[PDB]
RNA sequence: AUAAAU
């Protein structure tokens, strides 16, 4: 869980970030609230334009699924009723897969969720709560639950999982499970052992995340 | 195409739907408007034509050839239709394209024997249509141009033997020398149905008030398929009595040779 | 009106009340099929519902939504 | 405080749905019912027609024109699904999947919507990850065609050679049409595709003497072999939802979950949902979870697994008979 | 292709008594729908027609309705897209006389016809012409089921590649489609298709009465 | 009895004019087209003729509506769940349920959802709200209330998402219908707190809307039950 | 004491706290919770019974609020008002013609599209188009709000602009006065207008404020102005 | 009543 992130790296965007886990590096940008196209307009809420760009080649139907899952996470996070008839552009440019993209899209999705959240924070958009996402996998022989697996670990996996939780109260209370994307097959005992150990390492991550946020931002403030 | 008020259209209908039918111009129900035709102006192509109507309607046809294996290439004559400032996809374009390809099929209204080179190879003919301007259904306009173009087309002459089954010689053509494409291009006439009257070469304003229309092909001195009823407009389309359909076929059957005669001049 | 009779009468006569035979080669049986529902008991076995009964569930809710004001 | 006597403005059932999708749902959930007149865990009946559109529909009379290898017609409730499987021959010089083209008809012309894009990829990704179609099952076992001089036509193929090898490869193209949509339709498209994949025949291929002029490589118009896929990995789709309803219920002399989401009211107002592809063996292929409207308790996940397993048993039984 | 999944582009495709069944109103996605299945000899045709409308067009100043028809390939990819547009243009030339357009000003009616299947058997030592009367039958049913006002029932028949559509009890013609075949079949085709029209008409009227009942 | 009870589209019902003999005097029955019928022209043997023809498959119902007597009969065709109801269209004087799409300073534009019938029952107009094919309407600031027509704060009257029952004064242009909530039975009917984020609110006072759940009170234009 | 979103609040539920930027009052649960990340600033007045708060956080996308000073650009003219956009890709704001000194229904203001104006936001609703007025009552008898002429405008994050307008301990205006004479308009929408007698001085001010905006350093800013005004000399 | 409805 030794992730590294930077905030406010882009000039011509309201908010931006660069999240890195292992190899997987994703840069995200957020502009909003701004004037929406007629087909995008929502009478009462904010409209989200979510774009995902791959590390190699052009955007295909694969990234269209990454956009859809990322939408399921970001939508309830943002206090959309604050911006009626308005638009918020959210663009993710995956710079480095950190995994065999021909087989997996696990780490890229989690990194996009974390980066998008950070970019929304930087942009100063109304959020109902906080959020964190981690990729999880299960081994073929050992059947161990590995949090933040490497590319080599994924090759020899039986199932791959994306978990994104909604946190409140100083990152101590799990408000809800925004997204759980499990591909593979499962046993109940392993799942809750995963959730128990997973919650611990997530809580450690938030604490680290809070440290990073304060350290960088405080010199800017008075 | 043309936009007319309700008053103008009714007056036009009265003028044309009358028992002694009168064109707004004054034409007779079988008189065509004057056209101009240019041929053999594209040296890069095997044949070419350019037709200009009286209302400024202009169409350009080009004829190119290509040696193909007639055992794998079923269609030996491909018609392609285009309009600058117009998308290719449009309903009108594809319909006319589909229609024209049927009019000039290999074994329907065209002597495809004159395209054969050897046992195994034949000449594929590409008929490219470019409609610069048009104010009505250009199907008959294009037809006249294709006719003129195909009657002034010159194809390369073969030198090598014509038996690929045995000796199998590569198709070679003698330099300079060419043979004129002897063929009988069909014509496509379009009629307008206003009440109980039938008009040859419908004008723009005439087509707007017409109840229906007919597209009748013509080849070898007789009526031939494709024959299609067509709505010239979409606001005044009505069903027609069968005798009108038989009247139209009869009308073309007697005035077509006159058109061909004025068109057959080299 | 008499003209109506000869033409109208002729037109009415023509149909002949001809018999109709019903069949579907493939699509017809499956596509026009009305909506249906099933319920899985504690046994894990599926259970069917009478068509009349299913409607009753509909008409009972409509009465419980309209009339039964609180 | 205020104590107030006032009347809530009531609307007809069909007007209440147009006015508010959430309000029309809450009034239903208060009586233990749904806008589609079903209970909390009540699903939709499923009736299918397999191999009706395929060329291998009839044993005696085989279609010479039809290029469909496998087919399936499905209708769950109001929504109708028509799946057709086509093929290709590709030279080759762990598991794979098929390439689906879903066309959801809403009565609007234009390009493919984001719905059709995601589903096509979701069907391709799930099949690829559920390990249904191995790359070895797509291997083309060719043959030879030797012709007598008008004396006879001879065709020869060898079973033994292919086993020893243990090489043209098959590619399965799919097209899924959707009529009468009423909600989340990914599950319907998956189930129809699964039934279609259960019955696929791969025609044998061979070449008449030819030289690497133009040479046409051809498949046989009659002989074919059934596609061998892992039945142990075969899964089925079902959708579930989580929501909370405020309204009070009268009495005459704590979260709730809904199974198989349908109707606009449920698709629009329920933001906590669960999607499962479950297998009869009890191995599970995939799980889709997203909570956006309410908390997702672990007790509700378990019910979904049980509900999904039950659905798999039901779907599996239908396939057998 | 970044829109759909076409798969490998380096690959190649595969290389190798009149009876009617009518059903309408089985689609809740549109305003009117129809299912037409016909089996003759070894040849059979099943197509679905979907009608959406009449729906208002913003800013439209048209004093009458606007009909749009599009044919689609449901399963078998046989008919060319160019030919589908041609029939569509032919079909619209028919129903613009059939549909009472004066009833729907500033409005438009979209008609989708899905040719899910046609089965053709040919013996070895036009084509779409035979499907045309079934498309007309389907649309006329789908329009009447939708609530669209029709001046008369539109029906047709196919005789030796010569299709001709009738209304007002065969007294007049709303469409004529002739391809190939043979000459001097004018009087014959008009009489044979008129029988097919009357047959298709009564079954169409009975269909509405049945489902409507 | 002379005319068929049920007519399919294209079936002849009755001629243009009609008459009968009773009480030693000719009574003239005047047949007029209605919903489901269309007066068209048919000619036989070179003779022109106008007759009432049904355009919808339904049972047929007649009803009288208004020396020598005088009469008027209304001929119509009624179909006979799914409801379509196209004949129904917003006309001057009708009551219409609408939903607020956007708020401006001098006016408030909405979209038409359903229309009130006549003797409650309503006619729901089915359309896509994510396209714009739905009929749009505009409520002027002067048409908000009869009380103080000049100065009216639109923010304190309506709200994005709130349901408003109004009456259409006129068609206007193709873009916006004219809507007035001047009378007592017109105004915001259904609404929620904080643009729909909070709980349901009910109408108490004509210019005040409260919520008996969170105790929230927002200023709206409320109607009377 | 940095504050993060979803952070617990010490204050008791019965006693109200006045809303501040960063602080959000949930319309559904009625709870008061922070939604922005930064430093919490709270002011208490009297022995007991009243409170106020907000969060100083780094944001750059302006959201119109009552009594906020903003610098806008009038893109276009409507029938009764100007269309002015405070910020790029941001909703338009409604400026009344009658919102000027000596206004009349007969004579419209002479402001043309492309002019800079100093304005204050009068009425700003979340679900309604915002409105600004050239003259603000609160400041004094005379607003001092008039369309700016020439000069140069500077992009700046909302925090930097708020500190420049309300904080007197901010050395930026002082260190610039130690180098040249200049007039400055400060907008809460993150816009700073600077104008000198000579372009080289205005340019020097632009470059300093930009670096100051970038640098965010008290010690650096005094030096920054030194090297900037120096560099212009040689460049001359 | 000194220039009205982009």
- Check whether residue F107 and residue F185 sit in a common domain: yes
- Check whether residue F75 and residue F123 sit in a common domain: no
Any A CB within 8 A of E4 CB: yes
Q: Tell me the nearest-neighbour CA distance from C32 into chain F, angstroms.
A: 15
Q: Which residue has the tokens 């020899």?
A: A156
Q: Please state whether beta strands G191-195 and G183-187 pair in parallel, antiparallel, or not at all (unpaired).
A: antiparallel
Distance CA(E205)–CA(G5), nearest Å, equals 68
Strand ranges, E, within chain E? 12-13, 19-24, 32-40, 43-56, 66-73, 107-119, 155-159, 162-167, 172-178
Token duo for residue E105: 């000003």
DSSP label at residue B33: P
Distance CA(F217)–CA(E119), nearest Å, equals 67
Distance CA(G38)–CA(A24), nearest Å, equals 29
Nearest to A43 among F161, F194, F197 (CB): F161
Angle value at C-alpha D162, between D157 and D163, nearest 5 degrees: 130
Nearest to F194 among A43, A81, A85 (CB): A81
Token duo for residue F185: 């039975």
Token duo for residue E150: 């029709």
Strand ranges, E, within G26-134? 32-34, 38-44, 51-57, 69-77, 81-85, 93-96, 116-123, 131-133
Query: What size, in residues, is chain D?
Result: 321
Tally D–E CB contacts below 8 A: 106
Number of domains in chain D: 1
Q: Tell me the nearest-neighbour CA distance from F191 into chain E, angstroms.
A: 28
Contact yes or no for B182/B172 (Cβ under 8 A)? no
Contact yes or no for E121/D64 (Cβ under 8 A)? yes
Distance CA(G29)–CA(F194), nearest Å, equals 11
Domain range spanning residue D299? 2-321
Contact yes or no for A103/A63 (Cβ under 8 A)? no
Report helix, strand or coil for D318. helix
Number of domains in chain F: 2
Nearest Cα to Cα of residue D30 among D273, D257, D250: D250
Q: Please state whether beta strands A86-96 and A46-53 pair in parallel, antiparallel, or not at all (unpaired).
A: parallel
CATH number of domain containing F164: 2.40.50.140
Q: Which phi and psi (to 5°) does residue D101 adopt?
A: -125, 90
Instruction: Report residue E198 CA to chain centroid gap.
Output: 17
Contact yes or no for A44/F195 (Cβ under 8 A)? yes
Token duo for residue G112: 């043309």
Token duo for residue C45: 């076995």
Distance CA(G92)–CA(A34), nearest Å, equals 10
CATH number of domain containing B64: 3.30.230.70
Query: What size, in residues, is chain A?
Result: 222
- Which positions in strand H are less than 7 Å from the protein's CB atoms? 2-3, 5-6
Q: Which residue of D has its CA nearest to A75?
A: D292
Q: Which phi and psi (to 5°) does residue E49 adopt?
A: -115, 130
Contact yes or no for A201/A166 (Cβ under 8 A)? no
* DSSP secondary structure string for all residues of A116-149: HHHHHHHHT--BSSEEEEEEEEEESSS--EEES-
Best of F3, F44, F53 to disrupt the C interface (most C CBs within 10 Å) is F44
Long-range contacts of B251-254 (CB under 8 A, 24+ apart): B251/B29, B251/B30, B251/B191, B251/B198, B251/B200, B252/B189, B252/B191, B252/B200, B252/B216, B252/B218, B252/B223, B253/B222, B253/B223
Contact yes or no for A167/A173 (Cβ under 8 A)? yes
Distance CA(F100)–CA(D20), nearest Å, equals 13
Where is D263: in which H helix or E strand? helix D263-269
Cβ-based neighbour number of residue E176 at 10 Å: 27
Cβ-based neighbour number of residue F139 at 10 Å: 27
Distance CA(A64)–CA(A50), nearest Å, equals 10
Question: Looking at F49, F80, F111, which one is the last position of a domain?
Answer: F80
Token duo for residue D81: 């699904």
Distance CA(B186)–CA(B218), nearest Å, equals 5
* DSSP secondary structure string for all residues of D53-69: SSGGG-SSS--SS---S
Q: Which phi and psi (to 5°) does residue C5 adopt?
A: -65, -50
Residues with Cβ within 8 Å of residue E213, at least 6 apart in sequence:
none
Domains annotated for chain G, with CATH where assigned, are 1-59 (2.40.50.100), 60-150 (2.40.50.140), 151-235 (3.30.1370.10)
Judge: E4–A61 Cβ closer than 8 Å, yes or no.
Answer: yes
Chains C and E make contact, 3+ CB pairs within 8 Å:
yes
Judge: G24–A79 Cβ closer than 8 Å, yes or no.
Answer: yes
- CA dihedral sign, ordered D181, D186, D190, D191: negative
Chains A and D make contact, 3+ CB pairs within 8 Å:
yes
Judge: C61–D248 Cβ closer than 8 Å, yes or no.
Answer: no
Residues with Cβ within 8 Å of residue F95, at least 6 apart in sequence:
F115, F116, F165, F166, F167, F186
How long is the CA A128 to C1' H4 vector, in angstroms? 51
Nucleotide nearest to G108 (CA to C1'): H4
- CA dihedral sign, ordered G14, G19, G21, G25: positive
Strand ranges, E, within chain A? 4-7, 15-21, 24-34, 46-53, 86-96, 130-139, 145-147, 157-168, 173-183
Nucleotide nearest to G105 (CA to C1'): H4
Contact yes or no for F17/E160 (Cβ under 8 A)? no
Alpha helices, H only, B112-172: 139-150
Contact yes or no for A54/A101 (Cβ under 8 A)? yes
Contact list, G128 vs chain F (CB under 8 Å): 103-105, 154-155
Nearest to E58 among F55, F79, F174 (CB): F174
How long is the CA F172 to C1' H6 vector, in angstroms? 22
Cβ-based neighbour number of residue B10 at 10 Å: 13
Q: Which residue of C has its CA nearest to E35?
A: C28
Q: Give the number of C-alpha atoms closer than 13 A to the C-alpha of residue G166, restricted to the C-beta side.
A: 11
* DSSP secondary structure string for all residues of F95-153: EEEEEEEEE-SSEEEEEEEEEE-----EEE----TTTT-SPEEEEEGGGS-SSSSS---
DSSP label at residue B13: H
Q: Which phi and psi (to 5°) does residue D189 adopt?
A: -70, -35
DSSP label at residue B89: T
Angle value at C-alpha E10, between E7 and E14, nearest 5 degrees: 75
Chains touching G (3+ CB pairs < 8 Å): A, F
**Cα-based distances in Å from A92 to A121, B111, D281, E131:** 15, 62, 39, 50
How long is the CA G106 to C1' H3 vector, in angstroms? 10
Euclidean distance between the first and final Cα of chain E, in Å?
A: 49
Angle value at C-alpha D108, between B88 and F177, nearest 5 degrees: 115
Token duo for residue C58: 């509909």
Token duo for residue B13: 């209908």
Q: Categorise residue A37: left if φ over 0, alpha if ψ from -120 to 50, beta otherwise.
A: beta
Residues with Cβ within 8 Å of residue C45, at least 6 apart in sequence:
none
Chains touching A (3+ CB pairs < 8 Å): D, E, F, G
Q: Please state whether beta strands B77-82 and B121-133 pair in parallel, antiparallel, or not at all (unpaired).
A: parallel
Token duo for residue F35: 């919903």
Any A CB within 8 A of E58 CB: no
Question: Looking at F47, F80, F113, which one is the last position of a domain?
Answer: F80
Token duo for residue G131: 């409105």
Distance CA(F94)–CA(F165), nearest Å, equals 11
CATH number of domain containing F40: 2.40.50.880
DSSP label at residue C33: P
Nearest Cα to Cα of residue A53 among A102, A88, A97, A9: A97
Report helix, strand or coil for G177. helix
Number of domains in chain B: 1
Report helix, strand or coil for D302. helix
Nearest to G35 among A44, A126, A220 (CB): A126
Any D CB within 8 A of F78 CB: no
Distance CA(D260)–CA(D184), nearest Å, equals 9
Q: Which phi and psi (to 5°) does residue A180 adopt?
A: -130, 110
Token duo for residue F212: 């008996």
Q: Tell me the nearest-neighbour CA distance from D22 into chain A, angstroms.
A: 15
Where is F20: in which H helix or E strand? strand F17-22
Distance CA(D189)–CA(D196), nearest Å, equals 10
The approach used to solve this structure was X-ray
Domain range spanning residue F50? 4-80
Q: Please state whether beta strands B58-69 and D236-243 pair in parallel, antiparallel, or not at all (unpaired).
A: unpaired
Residues with Cβ within 8 Å of residue B229, at least 6 apart in sequence:
B212, B213, B214, B215, B240, B245, E90, E93, E173, E175, E176, E177
Strand order across the G191-195 sheet: G152-155, G191-195, G183-187
- Check whether residue F65 and residue F91 sit in a common domain: no
Q: Which phi and psi (to 5°) does residue G209 adopt?
A: -60, -40
Instruction: Report residue C61 CA to chain centroid gap.
Output: 21
- Check whether residue F73 and residue F99 sit in a common domain: no
Angle between helical axes of B242-263 and E186-212 (0-180°, round to 10): 140
Contact list, F136 vs chain E (CB under 8 Å): 58
Nearest Cα to Cα of residue D261 among D275, D247, D245: D275
Angle value at C-alpha B68, between B64 and B74, nearest 5 degrees: 100
Best of G58, G86, G172 to disrupt the A interface (most A CBs within 10 Å) is G58
Chains G and C make contact, 3+ CB pairs within 8 Å:
no
Any E CB within 8 A of C31 CB: yes
CATH number of domain containing D181: 3.30.230.70
Distance CA(D96)–CA(D111), nearest Å, equals 28
Judge: D6–F124 Cβ closer than 8 Å, yes or no.
Answer: no
CATH number of A1-222: 3.30.230.70
Contact yes or no for F166/F185 (Cβ under 8 A)? no
Distance CA(E2)–CA(G103), nearest Å, equals 58
- CA dihedral sign, ordered D247, D252, D254, D258: negative
Query: What size, in residues, is chain B?
Result: 266
Nearest Cα to Cα of residue D225 among D199, D195, D192: D199
**Cα-based distances in Å from D94 to D97, D281, G60:** 10, 21, 49
Domains annotated for chain E, with CATH where assigned, are 1-211 (3.30.230.70)
Report helix, strand or coil for G94. strand
Strand ranges, E, within chain D? 46-50, 70-76, 79-90, 95-96, 99-104, 133-134, 143-147, 153-156, 169-179, 201-208, 218-226, 236-243, 256-259, 272-278, 284-291
């Amino acid at each position: 869980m030794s992730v590294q992130a930077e905030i406010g790296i882009l000039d011509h965007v309201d908010g931006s970030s660069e999240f890195v886990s292992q190899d997987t590096k994703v840069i995200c940008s957020v502009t909003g609230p701004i004037e929406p196209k007629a087909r995008q307009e929502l009478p009462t809420q904010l409209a989200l334009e979510i774009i995902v760009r791959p590390a190699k080649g052009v955007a295909t139907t694969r990234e269209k699924v990454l956009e859809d899952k990322l939408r399921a996470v970001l939508t309830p996070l943002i206090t959309r009723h604050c911006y009626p008839r308005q638009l918020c552009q959210i663009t993710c440019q995956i710079l480095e897969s950190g995994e065999d993209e021909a087989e997996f899209s696990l780490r890229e999705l989690s990194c996009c969720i974390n980066a998008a959240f950070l970019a929304l924070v930087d942009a100063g958009i109304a959020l109902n709560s906080m959020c964190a996402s981690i990729p999880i996998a299960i081994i073929k022989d050992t059947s161990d639950i590995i949090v933040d697996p490497t590319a080599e670990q994924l090759k020899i996996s039986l199932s791959v999982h994306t978990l994104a939780l909604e946190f409140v109260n100083g990152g101590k209370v799990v408000k809800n499970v925004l997204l759980l994307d499990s591909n593979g097959d499962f046993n109940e005992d392993q799942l809750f052992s995963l959730l128990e150990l997973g919650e611990q390492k997530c809580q450690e991550l938030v604490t680290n995340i809070r440290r990073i946020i304060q350290d960088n931002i405080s010199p800017r403030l008075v | 195409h043309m936009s007319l008020s309700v008053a103008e259209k009714s007056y036009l209908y009265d003028s044309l739907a009358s028992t002694p039918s009168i064109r707004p111009d004054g034409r007779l129900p079988h008189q065509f408007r004057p056209i101009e035709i240019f041929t053999d102006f594209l040296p890069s192509s095997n044949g070419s034509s350019r037709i200009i109507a009286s209302d400024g309607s202009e169409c350009i046809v080009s004829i190119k050839s290509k040696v193909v294996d007639h055992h794998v290439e079923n269609e030996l004559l491909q018609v392609d239709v285009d309009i600058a400032g117009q998308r290719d996809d449009a309903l009108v374009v594809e319909t006319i394209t589909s229609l024209l390809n049927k009019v000039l099929k290999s074994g329907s209204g065209v002597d495809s024997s004159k395209l054969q080179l050897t046992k195994k190879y034949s000449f594929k003919i590409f008929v490219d249509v470019l409609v610069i301007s048009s104010h009505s259904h250009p199907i008959s306009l294009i037809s006249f141009a294709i006719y003129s173009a195909l009657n002034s087309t010159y194809l390369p002459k073969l030198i090598s033997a014509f038996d690929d089954l045995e000796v199998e010689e590569l198709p070679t053509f003698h330099d300079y020398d060419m043979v004129k494409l002897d063929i009988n291009p069909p014509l496509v006439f379009i009629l307008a149905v206003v009440g109980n009257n039938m008009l040859l070469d419908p004008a723009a304003n005439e087509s707007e008030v017409a109840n229906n229309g007919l597209i009748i092909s013509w080849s070898n001195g007789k009526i031939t398929s494709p024959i299609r009823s067509v709505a010239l407009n979409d606001s005044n389309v009505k069903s027609f009595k069968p005798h009108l359909l038989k009247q139209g076929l009869a009308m073309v059957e007697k005035y077509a040779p006159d058109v061909v005669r004025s068109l057959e001049n080299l | 009106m008499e003209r109506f009779s000869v033409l109208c009468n002729s037109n009415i006569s023509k149909s002949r009340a001809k018999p109709v035979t019903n069949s579907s080669i493939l699509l017809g049986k499956i596509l026009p099929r009305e909506e249906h529902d099933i319920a899985y008991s504690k046994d894990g076995l599926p259970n069917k519902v009478k068509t009349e009964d299913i409607r009753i569930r509909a008409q009972n809710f409509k009465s419980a939504l309209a009339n039964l004001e609180d | 405080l205020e104590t107030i006597e006032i009347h809530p403005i009531t609307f007809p059932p069909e007007v209440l749905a147009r006015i508010s999708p959430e309000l029309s749902l809450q009034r239903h959930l208060s009586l233990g019912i749904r806008p589609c007149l079903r209970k909390y865990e009540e699903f939709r009946d499923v009736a299918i027609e397999n191999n009706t559109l395929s060329r291998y529909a009839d044993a005696g009379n085989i279609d010479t024109k039809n290029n469909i290898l496998g087919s399936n017609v499905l209708k769950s409730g109001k929504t109708i699904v028509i799946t057709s499987i086509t093929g290709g021959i590709i030279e080759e010089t762990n598991y794979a999947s098929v390439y689906p083209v879903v066309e959801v008809e809403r009565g609007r012309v234009g390009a493919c919507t984001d719905e059709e894009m995601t589903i096509s990829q979701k069907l391709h990704d799930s099949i690829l990850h559920s390990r249904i179609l191995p790359k070895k099952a797509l291997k083309v076992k060719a043959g030879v065609r030797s012709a007598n001089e008008d004396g006879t036509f001879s065709v020869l193929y060898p079973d033994e050679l292919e086993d020893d090898t243990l090489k043209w490869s098959y590619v399965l193209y799919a097209k899924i049409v959707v009529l009468s949509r009423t909600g989340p339709v990914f599950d319907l498209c998956w189930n129809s595709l699964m039934y279609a994949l259960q019955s696929v025949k791969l025609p044998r291929a061979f070449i008449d003497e030819r030289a690497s002029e133009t040479y046409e490589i051809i498949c046989d118009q009659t002989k074919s072999v059934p596609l061998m896929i892992n039945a142990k990995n075969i899964a089925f789709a079902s959708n579930y939802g989580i929501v909370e309803l405020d309204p009070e219920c009268q009495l005459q002399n704590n979260t709730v979950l809904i199974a198989d989401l349908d109707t606009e009211a449920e698709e629009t107002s329920i933001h906590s949902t669960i999607s499962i592809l479950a297998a009869p063996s009890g191995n599970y292929k995939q799980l889709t979870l997203m909570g956006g409207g309410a908390k997702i308790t672990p007790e509700m996940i378990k019910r979904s697994l049980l509900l999904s397993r039950v659905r798999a048993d039901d779907l599996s039984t239908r396939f057998n008979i | 292709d970044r829109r759909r999944l076409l798969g490998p582009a380096a690959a190649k495709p595969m290389a190798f008594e009149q009876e009617l069944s009518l059903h309408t109103g089985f689609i809740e996605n549109c305003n009117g729908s129809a299912l037409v299945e016909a089996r003759s000899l070894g040849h059979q045709t099943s197509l679905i027609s979907a009608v959406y409308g009449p729906r208002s067009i913003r800013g439209s100043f048209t004093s009458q309705g606007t009909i749009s028809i599009q044919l689609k390939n449901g399963l078998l990819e046989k008919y060319n897209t160019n030919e589908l547009k041609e029939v569509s243009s032919f079909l619209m030339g028919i129903f613009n006389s059939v549909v009472n357009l004066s009833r729907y000003p500033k409005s438009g009616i979209d008609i989708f016809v899905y040719l899910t299947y046609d089965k053709d058997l040919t013996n070895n030592p036009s084509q779409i012409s035979s499907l045309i009367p079934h498309c007309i039958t389907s649309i006329t049913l789908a329009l009447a089921d939708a609530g669209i006002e029709l001046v008369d029932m539109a029906g047709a028949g196919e005789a030796n590649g010569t299709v001709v559509s009738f209304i007002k009890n065969g007294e007049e013609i709303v469409g004529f489609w002739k391809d190939d075949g043979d000459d001097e079949d004018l009087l014959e085709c008009l009489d044979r298709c008129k029988e097919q029209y009357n047959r298709y008409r009564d079954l169409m009227i009975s269909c509405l009465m049945n489902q409507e009942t | 009895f002379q005319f068929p009870e049920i007519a399919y589209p294209g079936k002849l019902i009755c001629p243009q004019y009609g008459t009968e003999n009773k009480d030693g005097e000719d009574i003239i029955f005047n047949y007029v087209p209605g919903p489901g019928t269309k007066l068209i022209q048919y000619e036989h043997n070179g003779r022109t003729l106008e007759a009432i023809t049904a355009t919808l498959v339904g049972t047929v119902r007649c009803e009288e509506e208004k020396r020598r007597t005088v009469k008027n009969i209304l001929v119509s065709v009624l179909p006979g769940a799914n409801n379509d109801f196209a004949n129904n269209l917003p006309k001057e004087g009708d009551i219409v349920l609408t939903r607020v799409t956007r708020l401006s300073l001098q006016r408030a534009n909405v979209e038409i959802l359903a229309v009130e019938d006549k003797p409650a029952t309503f006619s729901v107009s089915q359309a896509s709200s994510d396209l714009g094919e739905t009929f749009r309407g505009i409520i002027r600031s002067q048409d908000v209330r009869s009380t103080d027509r000049d100065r009216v704060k639109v923010i304190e009257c309506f709200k994005p998402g709130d349901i408003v029952r109004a009456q259409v004064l006129s068609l206007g242009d193709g873009t916006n219908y004219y809507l007035t909530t001047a009378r007592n039975d017109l105004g915001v009917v259904f609404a929620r707190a904080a643009n729909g984020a909070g709980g349901l609110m009910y109408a108490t006072d004509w210019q005040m809307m409260t919520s008996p759940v969170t105790g929230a009170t927002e200023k709206r234009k409320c109607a009377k039950p | 004491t940095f504050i993060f979103p979803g952070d617990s609040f010490p204050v008791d539920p019965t006693t109200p706290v006045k809303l501040g930027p960063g602080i959000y009052c949930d319309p559904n649960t009625q709870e008061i919770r922070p939604v922005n990340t930064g430093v919490l600033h709270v002011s208490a007045k009297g022995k007991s019974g009243v409170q106020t708060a907000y969060i100083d956080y780094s944001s750059k996308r302006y959201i119109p609020s009552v009594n906020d000073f903003v610098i806008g650009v009038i893109i276009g003219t409507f029938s009764d008002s100007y269309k002015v956009s405070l910020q790029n890709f941001s909703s338009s704001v409604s400026l009344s013609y009658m919102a000027f000194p000596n206004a009349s229904k007969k004579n419209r203001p002479t402001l043309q599209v492309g002019d800079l104006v100093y304005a204050r936001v009068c009425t700003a609703e979340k679900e309604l188009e915002a409105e600004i007025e050239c003259f603000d009552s609160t400041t004094g008898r005379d607003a001092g709000f008039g369309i700016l002429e020439d000069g140069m405008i500077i992009d700046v994050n909302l925090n930097f602009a708020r500190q420049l307008l309300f904080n007197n301990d901010f050395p930026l205006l002082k260190v610039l006065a130690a180098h040249t004479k200049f007039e400055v308009a400060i907008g809460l929408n993150g816009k700073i207008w600077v104008k000198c007698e000579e372009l080289s001085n205005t340019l020097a001010c632009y470059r300093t404020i930009m670096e100051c905006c970038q640098k965010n350093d008290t010690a650096a800013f005094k030096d920054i102005a030194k090297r900037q005004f120096k560099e212009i000399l040689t460049v001359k």
